[PDB]
Design a protein around this ligand. Structure first.
Ligand SMILES: [Mg+2]
Ligand SMILES: [Mg+2]
Ligand SMILES: [Mg+2]
Ligand SMILES: [Mg+2]
Ligand SMILES: [Mg+2]
Ligand SMILES: [Mg+2]
Ligand SMILES: [Mg+2]
Ligand SMILES: [Mg+2]
Ligand SMILES: [Mg+2]
Ligand SMILES: [Mg+2]
Ligand SMILES: [Mg+2]
Ligand SMILES: [Mg+2]
Ligand SMILES: [Mg+2]
Ligand SMILES: [Mg+2]
Ligand SMILES: [Mg+2]
Ligand SMILES: [Mg+2]
Ligand SMILES: [Mg+2]
Ligand SMILES: [Mg+2]
Ligand SMILES: [Mg+2]
Ligand SMILES: [Mg+2]
Ligand SMILES: [Mg+2]
Ligand SMILES: [Mg+2]
Ligand SMILES: [Mg+2]
Ligand SMILES: [Mg+2]
Ligand SMILES: [Mg+2]
Ligand SMILES: [Mg+2]
Ligand SMILES: [Mg+2]
Ligand SMILES: [Mg+2]
Ligand SMILES: [Mg+2]
Ligand SMILES: [Mg+2]
Ligand SMILES: [Mg+2]
Ligand SMILES: [Mg+2]
Ligand SMILES: [Mg+2]
Ligand SMILES: [Mg+2]
Ligand SMILES: [Mg+2]
Ligand SMILES: [Mg+2]
Ligand SMILES: [Mg+2]
Ligand SMILES: [Mg+2]
Ligand SMILES: [Mg+2]
Ligand SMILES: [Mg+2]
Ligand SMILES: [Mg+2]
Ligand SMILES: [Mg+2]
Ligand SMILES: [Mg+2]
Ligand SMILES: [Mg+2]
Ligand SMILES: [Mg+2]
Ligand SMILES: [Mg+2]
Ligand SMILES: [Mg+2]
Ligand SMILES: [Mg+2]
Ligand SMILES: [Mg+2]
Ligand SMILES: [Mg+2]
Ligand SMILES: [Mg+2]
Ligand SMILES: [Mg+2]
Ligand SMILES: [Mg+2]
Ligand SMILES: [Mg+2]
Ligand SMILES: [Mg+2]
Ligand SMILES: [Mg+2]
Ligand SMILES: [Mg+2]
Ligand SMILES: [Mg+2]
Ligand SMILES: [Mg+2]
Ligand SMILES: [Zn+2]
Lengths: 118, 23, 112, 69, 83, 181
RNA sequence: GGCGCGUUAACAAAGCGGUUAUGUAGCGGAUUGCAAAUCCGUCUAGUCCGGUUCGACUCCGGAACGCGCCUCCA
RNA sequence: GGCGACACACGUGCUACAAUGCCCACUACAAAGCGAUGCCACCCGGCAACGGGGAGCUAAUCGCAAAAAGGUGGGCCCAGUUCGGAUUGGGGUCUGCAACCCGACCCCAUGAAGCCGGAAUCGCUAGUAAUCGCGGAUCAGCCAUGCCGCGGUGAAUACG
RNA sequence: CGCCUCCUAAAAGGUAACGGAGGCGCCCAAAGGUCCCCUCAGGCGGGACGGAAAUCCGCCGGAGAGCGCAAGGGUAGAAGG
């Protein structure tokens, strides 16, 4: 549990390894390194704890992450479901939420096919 | 790939612009 | 009578492969009618064709008032259409037969 | 305790990346941690992180009020 | 969403009712057809009968659902399931 | 009999606050820490391996005390378990070893818990003892990601001489147990 | 009545103290103008009651039902 | 309000599964079309979509314009990855009276399935197939990955 | 059809019926000798995975557990671990 509670891969670069935390893309990768002056191309195997504890201090303090982001979004859908919004409706039944078609695909959200008789 | 709107190729495919492909 | 559960025996009449197909139409017509009546349907005897229909189907209509309504469907039902088994685009007059019967008892037999 | 079977305990110094230092005893005489009691959010009072919310949702948008009376 | 530079949209023949109500001592049932209208804090407590194409759905309005439209809560397709 | 920072705090800081809070008349009436019993209810090591020997290696680096096996009282078909199998390790910590362990549990280990929002206020025995359960053993400082090879949690039992829950709740909180609710 | 054998899914029929029987059918797909045949896949189980055992479709005891055999001399 | 539904099933496609690839930066070479509540140069604010300005053109004149693979350089190092972009959360832009059902686009976060696909099955004989981007009609916007087009790079094999 | 346990069996022993119910034809190299140590089933509460039930803590719990296998007797002041 190195940074933000998640050990980040070594033998890789810092900007690509920061992505391996839930809550950081290429953007916040590029950001936290510039905004802390840490070479984005360093092997994680070659970082003194100065860069480490500085980078971690930025990353944990700046953005809502790992469990916080997961718990926050968990309340979000829950809230839509509670009130009875359409997006909450379609979160109860596990269907599309952003208005896709359902007659055919939706298999990412409706899981594997459940072939019936017909 | 041409589906990742978060890249230049994806912006080319959709013909739109943005950060990852600016004009 | 009118209040007891009913049994419907759909048989294919003159028409051959398409009589059985029309019988399949009358079959779906009564199962779907039954739902729009709250009546409960279960199959007791089915005899399908590979073309999709049945030479014979028997099914019950479990509902307080099934015989009162379904009893008007007994008789010969005539279809005139261009069958899916026809290849020269002709109109064929075919028949299916519907039998409507009150659900019998099962009364046990002992000697007096 | 039985000899030969137990890891000997030596006086240990445990350093957290916030500069906190804790004199304890351990199997290792020096361990470096990234969190501790002195700098943990739940510990440092509230130390409410980026979630100083108020939500603020949603009536606390107020983004408008222009619509007539 | 509707552009921020524009005004947060309410059909105003329905906001009028809620504020005229807030004066005279509400709250009765307000049958509307304006599903398209966003919900405003002026309607919390009220019960609006949002039509769904067939019928009028009473919807009580609470603070966890301000930014939403009134038609999200009067859905239009009765599903039940399959089988 | 050595000085442990949390041990001083019990005598110096905790004892008088407890007397002040409950009004005991005898020096032995005031709650005390009896023991901490740490059980890894493994049971994966039923027929899969003697994986215990690695968990004992790490449970010993965490507490300085070599644990001791626990064997199945009976056989259970569903658990794929026959009576007598090595299904867990238990280590009993007393005195200085008990103090040294909690001192690191409260200060550095409970903080390293992911998304730690306090200890459960209701996990009290009903009779003045407390039990918490952990999900993984890297929470403790002596265990790293390199020498680890599997996520094994545990159950921690802290036994006190307090007759009521309220007396025990005061003792732990005064020691440094961060209670959630 | 006695003695023997049995009850498994849609049907027929096996092994087994822990474990996809099998054939055909049924269900999804392919092929075909269509249907068969064929090809790729797939699926539903142990009569009831009580025991034994960590664990019973499997072993024990009994009940119901079915089958086979016997019921002779006075 | 529905035509947009979703236990399922088929057709037609797009995007992939990666290194002959992906990424970023810089540097090239088309054709055919469209355009006065229209095309929008250029400028500024905005990470951006865009917004505010603002020339020129009733158009071989002005604009849509970037063509893309291509080229140079650096990076990734064979992993569900700097492959893939589905899903969902949050924050925005625009059109239109109005974007709940049910719009498109932008940014941040999320990074699913997929490791080249069973029986089977389609296209194509040369500037063809493959690959690469560009324009139109319809049209407020757009669910276009569709259609009709347009050129760039450019094969294999045909005994019979 | 021999052997074991209970009942019938009429409070010593014994006691029959094609009376009511069950079991044996083994096993254990420790499941034997001795010394030393230990005490159950179950109920409630508490505890990551972990459930009715795996292991851990506490309280109550004299024996209702256990003792290879039938039943009976016996049995933790051990014959049980
Ligand atoms: Mg990430
Ligand atoms: Mg859509
Ligand atoms: Mg014909
Ligand atoms: Mg005192
Ligand atoms: Mg010691
Ligand atoms: Mg409690
Ligand atoms: Mg106590
Ligand atoms: Mg550690
Ligand atoms: Mg059998
Ligand atoms: Mg059978
Ligand atoms: Mg056989
Ligand atoms: Mg056999
Ligand atoms: Mg089979
Ligand atoms: Mg088939
Ligand atoms: Mg066919
Ligand atoms: Mg059983
Ligand atoms: Mg049984
Ligand atoms: Mg079984
Ligand atoms: Mg059985
Ligand atoms: Mg039996
Ligand atoms: Mg004779
Ligand atoms: Mg239509
Ligand atoms: Mg839809
Ligand atoms: Mg298919
Ligand atoms: Mg398509
Ligand atoms: Mg397809
Ligand atoms: Mg146009
Ligand atoms: Mg992945
Ligand atoms: Mg996978
Ligand atoms: Mg990608
Ligand atoms: Mg969104
Ligand atoms: Mg819409
Ligand atoms: Mg990726
Ligand atoms: Mg690969
Ligand atoms: Mg030709
Ligand atoms: Mg390509
Ligand atoms: Mg196009
Ligand atoms: Mg258009
Ligand atoms: Mg004899
Ligand atoms: Mg004998
Ligand atoms: Mg006697
Ligand atoms: Mg007696
Ligand atoms: Mg006597
Ligand atoms: Mg007498
Ligand atoms: Mg005698
Ligand atoms: Mg006798
Ligand atoms: Mg006699
Ligand atoms: Mg005798
Ligand atoms: Mg017997
Ligand atoms: Mg016998
Ligand atoms: Mg013995
Ligand atoms: Mg013995
Ligand atoms: Mg001995
Ligand atoms: Mg117990
Ligand atoms: Mg319990
Ligand atoms: Mg338990
Ligand atoms: Mg006993
Ligand atoms: Mg036993
Ligand atoms: Mg026995
Ligand atoms: Zn610290």
């Amino acid at each position: 549990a190195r940074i933000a509670g998640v050990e980040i891969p070594r033998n890789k670069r810092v900007d690509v390894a920061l992505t391996y935390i839930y809550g950081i893309g290429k953007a916040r990768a590029k950001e936290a390194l510039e905004k802390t002056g840490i070479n984005p191309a360093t092997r994680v195997k070659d970082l003194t704890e100065a860069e480490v504890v500085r980078l971690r201090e930025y990353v944990e303090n700046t953005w809502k992450l790992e469990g916080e982001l997961r718990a926050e979004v968990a309340a979000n859908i829950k809230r839509l479901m509670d009130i009875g919004c359409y997006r909450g409706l379609r979160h109860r039944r596990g269907l599309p939420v952003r208005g896709q078609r359902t007659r055919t695909n939706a298999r990412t959200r409706k899981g594997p096919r459940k072939t019936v008789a017909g | 790939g041409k589906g990742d709107r978060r890249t230049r190729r994806g912006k080319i495919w959709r013909g739109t612009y943005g950060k990852y492909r600016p004009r | 009578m009118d209040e007891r559960d009913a049994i419907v025996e759909i048989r294919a009449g003159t028409g051959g492969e398409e009589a059985a197909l029309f019988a399949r139409d009358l079959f779906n017509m009564y199962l779907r009618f039954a739902e729009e009546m709250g009546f409960e349907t279960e199959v007791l005897d089915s005899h399908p064709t590979d073309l999709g229909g049945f030479s014979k189907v028997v099914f019950e209509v479990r509902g307080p008032g099934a015989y009162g309504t379904f009893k008007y469907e007994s008789g010969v039902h005539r279809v005139q259409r261009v069958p899916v088994t026809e290849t020269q685009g002709r109109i064929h007059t075919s028949t299916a037969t519907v039998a409507v019967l009150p659900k019998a008892e099962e009364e046990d037999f002992a000697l007096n | 305790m039985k000899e030969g079977i137990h890891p000997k305990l030596v006086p240990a110094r445990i350093i957290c990346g916030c500069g906190n230092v804790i004199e304890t005893y351990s199997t290792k005489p020096e361990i470096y941690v990234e969190v501790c009691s002195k700098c943990h959010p739940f510990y440092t009072g509230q130390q409410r992180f980026v979630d100083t919310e108020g939500r603020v949702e949603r009536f606390q948008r107020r983004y408008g009020d222009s619509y007539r009376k | 969403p509707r552009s921020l530079k524009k005004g947060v949209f309410v059909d105003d023949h329905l906001l009028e009712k809620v504020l005229e109500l807030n004066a005279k001592g509400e709250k009765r049932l307000i049958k509307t057809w304006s599903r398209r209208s966003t919900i405003v804090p002026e309607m919390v407590g009220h019960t609006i009968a949002v039509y769904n194409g067939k019928q009028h759905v009473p919807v009580y309005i609470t603070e966890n659902m301000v930014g939403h439209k009134l038609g999200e809560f009067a859905p239009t397709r009765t599903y039940r399931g399959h089988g | 009999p050595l000085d442990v920072a949390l041990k001083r705090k019990y005598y110096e800081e905790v004892r008088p606050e407890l007397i002040r809070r409950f009004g005991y008349q005898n020096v032995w009436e005031v709650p005390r820490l009896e023991k901490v019993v740490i059980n890894q209810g493994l049971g994966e090591a039923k027929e899969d391996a003697r994986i215990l020997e690695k968990a004992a290696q790490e449970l010993a680096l965490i507490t300085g005390q070599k644990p001791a096996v626990t064997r199945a009282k009976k056989s259970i078909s569903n658990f794929k378990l026959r009576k007598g199998m090595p299904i867990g390790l238990r280590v009993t910590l007393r005195r200085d070893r008990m103090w040294i362990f909690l001192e690191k549990l409260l200060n550095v280990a409970l903080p390293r818990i992911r998304d730690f929002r306090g200890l459960n206020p209701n996990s009290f025995d009903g009779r003045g003892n407390y039990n918490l359960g952990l999900r993984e053993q890297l929470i403790f400082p002596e265990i790293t990601y390199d020498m680890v090879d599997a996520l094994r949690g545990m159950d921690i039992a802290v036994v006190t001489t307090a007759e009521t829950d309220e007396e025990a709740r005061a003792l732990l909180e005064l020691l440094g147990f961060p209670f959630r609710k």
